[PDB]
Structures are given as C-alpha cells and as structure tokens.
Enzyme design. Structure first.
Site, PDB file in Angstrom:
ATOM      1  N   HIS A  40       0.092   3.074  -7.171  1.00 15.67           N
ATOM      2  CA  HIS A  40       0.857   4.003  -7.732  1.00 15.67           C
ATOM      3  C   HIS A  40       2.396   3.657  -7.127  1.00 15.67           C
ATOM      4  O   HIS A  40       3.115   4.394  -7.801  1.00 15.67           O
ATOM      5  CB  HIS A  40       0.631   5.406  -7.037  1.00 15.67           C
ATOM      6  CG  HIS A  40       1.082   5.660  -5.568  1.00 15.67           C
ATOM      7  ND1 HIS A  40       0.388   5.566  -4.425  1.00 15.67           N
ATOM      8  CD2 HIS A  40       2.207   6.061  -5.239  1.00 15.67           C
ATOM      9  CE1 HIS A  40       1.103   5.963  -3.482  1.00 15.67           C
ATOM     10  NE2 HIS A  40       2.221   6.325  -3.978  1.00 15.67           N
ATOM     11  N   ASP A  84      -6.395   2.551  -5.523  1.00 15.44           N
ATOM     12  CA  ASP A  84      -4.715   2.531  -5.422  1.00 15.44           C
ATOM     13  C   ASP A  84      -4.666   1.313  -4.806  1.00 15.44           C
ATOM     14  O   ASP A  84      -4.151   1.153  -3.576  1.00 15.44           O
ATOM     15  CB  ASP A  84      -4.422   3.985  -4.720  1.00 15.44           C
ATOM     16  CG  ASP A  84      -2.849   4.010  -4.650  1.00 15.44           C
ATOM     17  OD1 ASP A  84      -2.228   3.259  -5.803  1.00 15.44           O
ATOM     18  OD2 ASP A  84      -2.306   4.728  -4.133  1.00 15.44           O
ATOM     19  N   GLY A 175       7.713   7.440   0.803  1.00 15.92           N
ATOM     20  CA  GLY A 175       8.332   6.307   0.861  1.00 15.92           C
ATOM     21  C   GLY A 175       7.488   5.086   1.901  1.00 15.92           C
ATOM     22  O   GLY A 175       8.259   4.126   1.912  1.00 15.92           O
ATOM     23  N   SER A 177       4.444   4.709   1.120  1.00 17.84           N
ATOM     24  CA  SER A 177       3.390   4.241   0.118  1.00 17.84           C
ATOM     25  C   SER A 177       3.320   2.883   0.077  1.00 17.84           C
ATOM     26  O   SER A 177       4.398   2.110  -0.228  1.00 17.84           O
ATOM     27  CB  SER A 177       3.691   5.077  -1.126  1.00 17.84           C
ATOM     28  OG  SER A 177       3.171   6.470  -1.112  1.00 17.84           O
ATOM     29  N   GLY A 178       2.197   2.312   0.141  1.00 18.38           N
ATOM     30  CA  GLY A 178       1.997   0.883  -0.271  1.00 18.38           C
ATOM     31  C   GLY A 178       1.807   0.026   0.952  1.00 18.38           C
ATOM     32  O   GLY A 178       1.622  -1.328   1.040  1.00 18.38           O
TER      33      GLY A 178
HETATM   34  N1  ABN Z   1       0.667  11.982   4.602  1.00 15.77           N
HETATM   35  C1  ABN Z   1       0.245  11.069   3.560  1.00 15.77           C
HETATM   36  C2  ABN Z   1       1.123  10.612   2.553  1.00 15.77           C
HETATM   37  C3  ABN Z   1       1.273   9.352   2.524  1.00 15.77           C
HETATM   38  C4  ABN Z   1       2.218   8.903   1.508  1.00 15.77           C
HETATM   39  C5  ABN Z   1       2.841   9.723   0.644  1.00 15.77           C
HETATM   40  C6  ABN Z   1       2.351  11.220   0.554  1.00 15.77           C
HETATM   41  C7  ABN Z   1       1.436  11.728   1.606  1.00 15.77           C
END
Ligand code: ABN
Ligand code: CA
Length: 223
Positions: A40, A84, A175, A177-178
């Site tokens: 994503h 993902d 932010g 993420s990944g």
């Molecule tokens: N609280 C988990 C999360 C991680 C990344 C993006 C949204 C939510």
C-alpha cells in the site's frame, strides 16, 4: 509511533525511509540491493534513504539510492490489505557498515507473546497530528490470533497478525506503514493497517512475513 521512545541514532540500522519528495513510508533493508515494504506504500519515483536518524537534516551517515524496480505481491488486494508486501530493488548496492545493515528473514513464524520492536517516523498522536523528525521505537507483543480476530471480526486473514496493547496508548500510526516489526532478531512483520492509532481494543495489524519468504527468495534470485 504513538507512546514510544526515541530510538537513538542508527540503533535500527535496517530501517529505511521511502522518499518521493518527502517521507511517506518505511521499509527494511534485507540485503545490499533489496528493501521490503508494504504494497500500500507503492508509488512511482521512490528514493530509498538509508542511515537516517533525523529525516530533515543531513547528518553524515546517509545513503540516498533511487529504486530501479518495484514489485508488489501478485495477490495484493488493496481492499482487504491481504498480502500487503512489496519488494524494491535499489539501482546500486548499499554500502553496509555499522549504521546501515540488513535484517534477516525468518525461518519460523513468531510466537504469541513475543516482544517485538516496531520503528518509524509516523504520527506520534492518537488524537491529532505531530510528525517527528527523528526515528521512534516501540516494544509491543504479538497478540493471540483469537484476540486479533475478536478486535477485527471478518477482517483478519492467515497473512496478518496483531501486535500491541488492547488498552490502547501505544501503537504504530500513519507514516510508519511499510516499516519493520523485528522479533528475536528477524523481520517478522510489516506495518500494515488498523483502525486509527492507539485506540482501545484496536491494535495494529501487520503483514506476516514468514508466509512470504519463498516468494521473496525466488523474486530476488530472478531480478
Ligand atoms: N495503528 C495501526 C496503523 C498503522 C499504520 C497506518 C494506520 C494504522
Ligand atoms: Ca538525515
């Protein structure tokens, strides 16, 4: 990261920042040429930033390397976030040192109750917005599958796990993420999704890396 701590410069040497003019996602260096992140987080025009602590100041240990190829998992579903995961190949090999190092892939899947390290430059507030410049860290346990499925009924696949605190207060966030979830010295998770950040009964959800090792190894061997 909400409710975490300042990691300390270059103490998480496998952490990368993905930059498209600005930081937008984390990732993990798995060898000198390849980064793992979340599907994503796909964008065209990625520069990988290694050796970072403060993402807004050049401190002297950075390596900035453009991506040559991105590969989103063949079965990624952006609606459900199943699968993902994404691989990014660097145009040139990174120079590995004490401040820039790879993280090993797992052999076995991590156990419930194991404490893991999650890191990133994402939002630090459960309500509101404040983005840090330096890398933040969080220790969080893997939750049981039955706790995870009860928190997100009908939404958890075998390729996901939950980690965090059902009481809230400590979590990954936008932010992050990944980025990596490291348990017992191996990359076990990728920051993927949840419902908000640090809200009660809504822990973070992470891509279960141990299910993807075959795909990662085959892909690296061919690209
Ligand atoms: N609280 C988990 C999360 C991680 C990344 C993006 C949204 C939510
Ligand atoms: Ca920097």
């Amino acid at each position: 990261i909400v409710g975490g701590y300042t990691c300390g410069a270059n103490t998480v040497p496998y952490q990368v920042s993905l930059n498209s003019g600005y930081h937008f996602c984390g990732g993990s260096l798995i060898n000198s040429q390849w980064v793992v992140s979340a599907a994503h987080c796909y964008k065209s025009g990625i520069q990988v930033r290694l050796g970072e602590d403060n993402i807004n100041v050049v401190e002297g240990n950075e390596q900035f390397i453009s991506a040559s190829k991105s590969i989103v998992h063949p079965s990624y579903n952006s609606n459900t976030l199943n699968n993902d995961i994404m691989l990014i190949k660097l145009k040139s090999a990174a120079s590995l040192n004490s401040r820039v190092a790879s993280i090993s892939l797992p052999t076995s899947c991590a156990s419930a109750g194991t404490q893991c390290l999650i890191s990133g430059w994402g939002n630090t507030k459960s309500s509101g917005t404040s983005y840090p410049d330096v890398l933040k860290c969080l220790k969080a346990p893997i939750l049981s599958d039955s706790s995870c499925k009860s928190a997100y009924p009908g939404q958890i696949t075998s390729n996901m796990f939950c980690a965090g605190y059902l009481e809230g207060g400590k979590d990954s966030c936008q932010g992050d993420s990944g980025g990596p979830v490291v348990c017992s010295g191996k990359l076990q998770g990728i920051v993927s999704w949840g419902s908000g950040c640090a809200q009660k009964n809504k822990p973070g959800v992470y891509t279960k890396v141990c299910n993807y090792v075959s795909w990662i190894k085959q892909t690296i061997a061919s690209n």
